């Protein structure tokens, strides 16, 4: 009754929040895959060094 356009503004704000949160979710997943590849990469690198540590 009193906050009709106010709640419309809230609807817009939550829509923007949904957009930013989707970008966060997506980009964090992207970085998760990135980090996992580089983690397993250097992991196995350490494993090879951990097994046959050169002179």
């Amino acid at each position: 009754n009193a906050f009709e356009p106010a709640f419309a503004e809230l609807a817009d704000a939550v829509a923007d929040l949904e957009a930013n949160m989707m970008h966060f979710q997506l980009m964090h997943e992207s970085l998760a895959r990135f980090s996992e590849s580089f983690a397993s990469f250097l992991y196995g690198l350490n494993m090879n060094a951990f097994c046959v540590d050169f002179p």
Binding site: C51, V52, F54, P55
Partner: protein, 50 residues
């Protein structure tokens, strides 16, 4: 006959000398790394996790 033989054979040996000379200038550094990696070659792998 002999003229062609001596000239051509001399050129052959000259180019062979060129070959080995440039190879000296471009490969002489290998034995250092060879000795290095021979010392590094001690490898044995057993994946404990596998």
């Amino acid at each position: 006959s002999y003229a062609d033989c001596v000239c051509s054979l001399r050129t052959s040996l000259a180019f062979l000398e060129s070959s080995v000379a440039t190879l000296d200038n471009g490969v002489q550094d290998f034995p250092r790394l060879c000795h290095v990696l021979r010392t590094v070659r001690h490898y044995e792998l057993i994946p404990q996790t596998t």
